[PDB]
Structure formats: C-alpha cells, structure tokens
From Swiss-Prot:
Residues covered by the Pyrin domain: 1-89
Phenotype when changing residue 77 to E: Impaired ability to homooligomerize into ordered polymers. Decreased PYCARD/ASC filament nucleation
Name of the protein: NACHT, LRR and PYD domains-containing protein 3
Connected disease: Familial cold autoinflammatory syndrome 1: A rare autosomal dominant systemic inflammatory disease characterized by recurrent episodes of maculopapular rash associated with arthralgias, myalgias, fever and chills, swelling of the extremities, and conjunctivitis after generalized exposure to cold. Rarely, some patients may also develop late-onset renal amyloidosis.
C-alpha cells in the first residue's frame, strides 16, 4: 500500500524526470542510513517494480523519505508536496 502510493507518484514522472530519479537512487548520498540501489535492477524496473525495489532495499519509511528528497532534487515540487502530504503514518 505504501508501495502502491509510491508507484503512483513514479508513474507521474516524465521520461527525463524518471532517468534523473533513477540516477539519484543509484547514486544516493551516503550518509542518511539509506542504501543506494543497484544500477541493473533499477534501470530495468518498471514503475511498480521500482517502488517494490526501493522498499526491499531500504524498508517503507526510508523509501518514502528517499522519494521525497529526490522529488525535490529533480524539481518535481508537485510530487514532493503530494508525497509530503500523503505520508503514511509509520
């Protein structure tokens, strides 16, 4: 269900946005308690599978935080504010 909420935001990424979102995942800055994702599985993953991959690598709460940060970073402030206002009660 977190997985499905995240998949829905990811389906809203334009092609350029998705490429950049995936780079950020693969290259995630290394002092958060977050683990970057492998390039093969990340590049290959469709939208729902990418949400699943994010949760499998980092768990629900961190995957959500990563998604919020990256949305801001790639200037999708709409998805940044939507995920922030649609954050699960952990």
């Amino acid at each position: 269900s977190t997985r499905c909420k995240l998949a829905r935001y990811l389906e809203d990424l334009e092609d350029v946005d998705l490429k950049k979102f995936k780079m950020h995942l693969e290259d995630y800055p290394p002092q958060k308690g977050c683990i970057p994702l492998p390039r093969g599985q990340t590049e290959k993953a469709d939208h729902v599978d990418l949400a699943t991959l994010m949760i499998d690598f980092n768990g629900e709460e961190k995957a959500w935080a990563m998604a919020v940060w990256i949305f801001a970073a790639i200037n999708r402030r709409d998805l940044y504010e939507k995920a922030k206002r649609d954050e699960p009660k952990w």
